[PDB]
Design a protein around this ligand. Structure first.
Ligand code: MG
Ligand code: MG
Ligand code: MG
Ligand code: MG
Ligand code: MG
Ligand code: MG
Ligand code: MG
Ligand code: MG
Ligand code: MG
Ligand code: MG
Ligand code: MG
Ligand code: MG
Ligand code: MG
Ligand code: MG
Ligand code: MG
Ligand code: MG
Ligand code: MG
Ligand code: MG
Ligand code: MG
Lengths: 75, 159, 168, 175, 187
RNA sequence: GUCUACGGCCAUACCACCCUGAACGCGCCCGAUCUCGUCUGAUCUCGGAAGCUAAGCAGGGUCGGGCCUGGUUAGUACUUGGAUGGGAGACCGCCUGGGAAUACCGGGUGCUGUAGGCUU
RNA sequence: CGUUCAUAGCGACGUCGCUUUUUGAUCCUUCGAUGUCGGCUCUUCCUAUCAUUGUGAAGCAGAAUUCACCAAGCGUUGGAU
RNA sequence: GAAACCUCCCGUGGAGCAGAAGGGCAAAAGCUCGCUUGAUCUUGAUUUUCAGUACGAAUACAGACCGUGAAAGCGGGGCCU
RNA sequence: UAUCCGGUAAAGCGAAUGAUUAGAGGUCUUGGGGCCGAAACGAUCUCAACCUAUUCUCAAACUUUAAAUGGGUAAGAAGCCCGGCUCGCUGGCGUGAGCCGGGCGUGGAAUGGAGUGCCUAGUGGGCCACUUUUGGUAAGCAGAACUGGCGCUGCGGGAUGAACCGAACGCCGGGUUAAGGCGCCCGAUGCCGACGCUCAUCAGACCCCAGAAAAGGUGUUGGUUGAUAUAGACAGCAGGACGGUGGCCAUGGAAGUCGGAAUCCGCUAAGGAGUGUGUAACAACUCACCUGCCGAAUCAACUAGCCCUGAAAAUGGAUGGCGCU
RNA sequence: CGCAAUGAAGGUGAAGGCCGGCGCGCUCGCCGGCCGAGGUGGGAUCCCGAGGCCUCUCCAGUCCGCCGAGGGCGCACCACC
């Protein structure tokens, strides 16, 4: 009593009932499996972003004032 | 039932082409992949360290990691019913920049040129592409000489 | 010689049924909205579109409709897609309500958009629900073989208009 | 190809121009077919064989029906063939006697089906040339070349066998 | 013969609430009407939520309702919750709020009213604002239920953190072959 | 025009034999005290500068081989899709689109980056 | 080969078939059972004709004969192991 | 002496690289020397079989402590299967 | 529309690997056997392997080439373009990454509402067809690929029928079709249907399909190629068929004649050093070139249509039946 | 049962920020004040709203809408840090 041994006959059909969906792409994928030495350093960089805040805020206010002067000169 | 061995059936795939054996010429090594570079994988026989598996040869995907002398590269591999985006660590020698994306960037650059200009002019320009339309109305001058008649030729047995 | 323009637009009739049909064909046939047998659609031609018709050749009869064909199809069997309900174009208040944002405000405008293949063709053509035509009066020649070789399938260019009259 | 009664068509076409070949040469044919649709197809088949030239690579310039210029003359037509047997492919020279080329080629297609069970798609017509009383090689044609032709219609079998399906009179076939 | 799959032709969303209780069903009669006759989509959202299950309308804690109204700008408003308002013993100072709820627990009721808070029923909200104008529509955390900790990529499937259904935790209930490296392997 | 040093692409750059090379280079070349290394100062290392383009090297040449690139081969071989087409089968023809490979015959025979010479 | 002569009768090396009275393949049917060899007895069919009727062939003088055709009407026995 | 050792020329690998075969390999991945223990200690990630579980086998890193080389580097076993 | 991947079909072997035919050329090597040589790369052949151009024919586990069908990516707001901050990484300065803050909108065709999570049954014997395909002489055999069937499924056609073709079913009226048909059975040709072919003492008569081949036939019908003939042929009857010559090899006899190398001249009008018969061997007979008569076409070799031979099974029998020219 | 885990166990056990000061601001240690469950992207929904759009006249002009370009708070939920 020998069987059928293997096949792939009805399988494509079976797969395509429910699509063959592409793998759901997000923005902001994880940093799992990224070269450790990198990840330390981007972690440290992220740690000290709040250091150098007061400088950054002022720079944007100076930029915003320069934009407001430019738009007044245009109008 | 076939053997599950890693390199089964790559007699031809991983085999340097005709009269291109020997030293892996150096541009190959010394060109830079960043994150998110579109990259097509193509295994190579000379370099056996960091070889991709025979399933990812031909396949294109994006770079996610870059180590000292290899590049982590997300590629989509189908499995019966489900496409699995998965991340593989190929050594540079088995990898090129895929040009597929550059022709796109060329077009967007050309669009940004054609958007900046034609704004002060006022005349809006076709930025979208369009498929090859039917080939328009036109005259054909049979200049002096008439058409050439083509009789089909009588059969004969050559061999 | 005056080689006139290659045609812009073609009517495409599904001339065989819905059993035992390959998956690539079947998909294209439901990208032309040709689900039932003897449904038809207008179709603007171009390298992309024409090749999609090439992949469904022995499943369709098609070609280049007359002016009269576009009228007869639209007036006798012109049905809007209006909130996804196939609704018969009994008045222009229907066409306008839907296509009036394109300058198309009446049956006549619609016919001109379909026949000249205007800017707004995609939107006027999709608005039209696919044409449920009857069986071909006087019969066909042969369903299964190409026009060129005696049958009905494939591109018959001018002669799609005869078929239209015997089905519409 | 199939049939009905054919029409001579003139079909001229060209491999469409390029940068390298700016004004390409026109090629004309004599393509017998039931309609222009299959005419043009038939044009492309013959050209493909002869010239590196496909329907994609070319444009048909002028397809046009061609009318017999002497319909109400009776003519003799020589026609050269190229058929396919069950076995090998062959050549012939048939001769027909007709009022037209179209009629004479149509006549051929029926004969070939009869005499050689050859179907349309197997047959290639190369040349069809009208011909004198002489230069007629077939005696089936030659017997009608005669001034005072004279024959009866001897055993004139009836049709209208079902106007009177039943009747008293046994029929008549002498006239 | 036509080719469509009739497979997902029937949408499975609820229409009415599955409950038979009469007071909720009156709210439904009211909000059906408002839903259909107002342009407010607030009414539609509220209406939709009246049909949902207990599970599906989780309790909104007082502290969660505080902090969501603490947010900048939604001040002098009314918070709405188709679920219930519960207490937080781990919050102390309760601002004076405006609230709608199908239920508010007896503690949560006291605390709010002691603050000078107003509590509203949903019939009252409609008369107060039939188009949902000036409302904060909140919800309880849907994925609070301990249930969800068993859902997902199964336990013993690498990089899953999915609670297994186990009779009792302890030294010798699971945590052998397939969690330790020492014992076979680990995921 | 051209070279040297480090090159990229790796024969349009290879091989064979033949001819010609101003100047600067590059070489061959002359030595072994020292450095270094050999059975051997041949190679390797080192100190030179009397000779010479003989050779390497460059540039050219050959109805040259080779390679590169077109034609032809051929709409041929093959081939996607089609038919209640043929044929006893083997196989073949048509429709619908796609379409090669030798032999054979042409043409070509390194391009170029950085840094520094020479022809002032 | 047949003295001689490819073909009266034969027929190598090759080749194309039919047949299911051989044996294999195969396992479709039957395992809530289709009684498993031979002989006896009896009927009927087939022809791929041994005899018998009518005929063509011969390397048919006669006699004896093999080769072929129409053809299955009628036959095809008694014993020893 | 067809074969010992030496020497000149040609030699795209037609040899060799433990083993089957396939791939790969020439101022090497072959042979011959010199020095060696990266076949050591330790986290995770990934690939391959895959259910996308294990085992084995492998890939890229990262942290130690070394080796070797003028150095750039290479090396956590065996060119790869 | 761009862009990568490929080593199957084909093709190739005067390109590698392996196979393999033939002659040219070559003392390459050298031989083993010869013949003429004492012996001699001397002369002459020869066969061995090797080589110089060529040449015949091949490959699932060969290949320089190399398709069709095929598999990735990409075709924008998660995108571009500016400004500035963070780093223990990297570093002559710079990288590279991560952060803030602004500035810009449809970016190929066609279609369609999407996403997402929980519980979950049955199933885990399959089979059939196109095409591809391995084992086997083959199988209604066994085994894969690809799609579509049947299984789960009725209906029109295929007489009959899982699976062929057409088409997929709520319950009904009118219309129209498909695939199939239209002598009668049986709805429709009871058309003045069109043109041919074919007579069978075994006719033939429609996918799957239920049946025949090699090889034959002046049966009849078409082709193809060559002839021929007024220097009046072609058949049909009538007249000669020789000599140089027992030609030479072969004697066992071949003066034309078991066989074979030859194989020309004369007379010529013309006869082969002979088609056969037959002879021990001759003889004798028989088989061109030309006339006489008769009076226009004649004849050969292929080829493909129908028909026929090839063609034998057991209850009486099946183009479905009746029948049909 | 639930409101706390994690470790084999001895056991341990879910806060952070900011500001000012004092220790050398040493991306470490100690003393005063303020906020108090972080942030990115998307998010039904609310909120603000330039501006229309008319009114039987030319303007003034509060009331009512309808839409609303643009801009905000952002539930749940998801992905990331
Ligand atoms: Mg099984
Ligand atoms: Mg079919
Ligand atoms: Mg259903
Ligand atoms: Mg020296
Ligand atoms: Mg020199
Ligand atoms: Mg020289
Ligand atoms: Mg050359
Ligand atoms: Mg004999
Ligand atoms: Mg049996
Ligand atoms: Mg019984
Ligand atoms: Mg018999
Ligand atoms: Mg080694
Ligand atoms: Mg290390
Ligand atoms: Mg292969
Ligand atoms: Mg092949
Ligand atoms: Mg079972
Ligand atoms: Mg079986
Ligand atoms: Mg079953
Ligand atoms: Mg079907």
């Amino acid at each position: 009593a020998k069987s059928k041994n293997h096949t792939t006959h009805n399988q494509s059909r079976k797969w395509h009932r429910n699509g063959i969906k592409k793998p759901r792409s997000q923005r902001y994928e994880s940093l799992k499996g990224v070269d450790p030495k990198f990840l330390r350093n981007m972690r440290f960089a992220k740690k000290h972003n709040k250091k150098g805040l007061k400088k950054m805020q002022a720079n944007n206010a100076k930029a915003m004032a320069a934009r407001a002067e430019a738009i007044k000169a245009l109008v | 039932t076939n053997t599950k061995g890693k390199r089964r059936g790559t007699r031809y795939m991983f085999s340097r082409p005709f009269r291109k054996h020997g030293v892996v010429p150096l541009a190959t090594y010394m060109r830079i992949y960043k994150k998110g570079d579109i990259v097509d994988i193509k295994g190579m026989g000379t370099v056996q360290k960091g070889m991709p598996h025979k399933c990812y040869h031909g396949k294109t995907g994006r770079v996610y990691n870059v180590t000292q002398h290899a590049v982590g590269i997300v590629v989509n591999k189908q499995v019966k019913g489900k496409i699995l985006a998965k991340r593989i660590n190929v050594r540079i020698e088995h990898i090129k920049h895929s040009k597929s994306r550059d022709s796109f960037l060329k077009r967007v650059k050309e669009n940004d040129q054609k958007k900046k200009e034609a704004k002060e002019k006022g005349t809006w320009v076709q930025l979208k592409r369009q498929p090859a339309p039917p080939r328009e109305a036109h005259f054909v001058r049979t200049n002096g000489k008439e058409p050439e008649l083509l009789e089909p030729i009588p059969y004969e047995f050559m061999a | 010689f005056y080689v006139p323009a290659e045609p812009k637009l073609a009517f495409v009739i599904r001339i065989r049924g819905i059993n035992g049909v390959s998956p690539k064909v079947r998909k294209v046939l439901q990208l032309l909205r040709l689900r039932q047998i003897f449904n038809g659609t207008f179709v603007k031609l171009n390298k992309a579109s024409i090749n999609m018709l090439r992949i469904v050749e022995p499943y369709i009869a098609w070609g280049y409709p007359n002016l009269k064909s576009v009228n007869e199809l639209i007036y006798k069997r012109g049905y809007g897609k209006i909130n996804k309900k196939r609704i018969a174009l009994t008045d222009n208040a229907l066409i306008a309500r839907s296509l009036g944002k394109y300058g198309i405000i009446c049956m006549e405008d619609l016919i001109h958009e379909i026949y000249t293949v205007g800017k707004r063709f995609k939107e006027a053509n999709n608005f039209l629900w696919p044409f449920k035509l009857s069986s071909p009066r006087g019969g066909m020649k042969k369903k299964t073989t190409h026009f060129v070789e005696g049958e009905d399938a494939g591109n018959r260019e001018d002669q799609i208009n005869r078929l239209i009259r015997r089905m519409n | 190809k199939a049939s009905g009664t054919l029409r001579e068509y003139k079909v001229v076409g060209r491999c469409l121009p390029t940068p390298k070949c700016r004004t390409p040469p026109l090629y004309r044919m004599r393509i017998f077919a039931p309609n222009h649709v299959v005419a043009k197809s038939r044009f492309w088949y013959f050209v493909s064989q002869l010239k590196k030239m496909k329907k994609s690579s070319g444009e048909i310039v002028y397809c046009g029906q061609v009318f017999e210029k002497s319909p109400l003359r009776v003519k003799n037509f020589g026609i050269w063939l190229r058929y396919d047997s069950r076995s090998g492919t062959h050549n012939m020279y048939r001769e027909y006697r007709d009022l037209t080329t179209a009629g004479a080629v149509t006549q051929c297609y029926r004969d070939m089906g009869a005499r050689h069970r050859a179907r349309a798609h197997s047959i290639q017509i190369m040349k069809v040339e009208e011909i004198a009383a002489s230069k007629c090689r077939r005696p089936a044609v030659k017997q009608f070349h005669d001034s005072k032709i004279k024959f009866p219609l001897p055993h004139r079998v009836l049709r209208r066998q079902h106007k009177p399906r039943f009747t008293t009179k046994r029929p008549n076939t002498f006239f | 013969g036509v080719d469509i799959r009739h497979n997902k032709d029937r949408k499975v969303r609820r229409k009415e609430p599955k409950s038979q209780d009469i007071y909720l069903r009156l709210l439904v009669k009211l909000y059906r009407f408002l839903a259909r006759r107002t342009n407010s989509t607030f009414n539609q959202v509220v209406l939709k939520r009246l049909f949902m299950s207990r599970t599906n309308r989780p309790p909104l804690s007082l502290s969660r309702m505080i902090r969501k109204m603490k947010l900048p700008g939604r001040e002098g408003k009314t918070a709405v919750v188709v679920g219930t308002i519960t207490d937080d013993v781990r919050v102390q100072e309760v601002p004076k709020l405006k609230v709608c709820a199908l239920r508010v627990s007896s503690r949560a009721r006291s605390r709010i009213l002691k603050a000078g808070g107003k509590i509203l029923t949903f019939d009252q909200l409609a008369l107060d604002s039939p188009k949902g104008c000036g409302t904060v529509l909140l919800s309880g955390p849907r994925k609070g239920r301990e249930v969800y900790r068993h859902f997902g990529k199964a336990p013993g499937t690498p990089h899953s953190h999915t609670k297994p259904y186990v009779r009792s935790k302890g030294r010798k209930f699971e945590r052998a072959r397939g969690r330790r490296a020492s014992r076979g392997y680990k995921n």
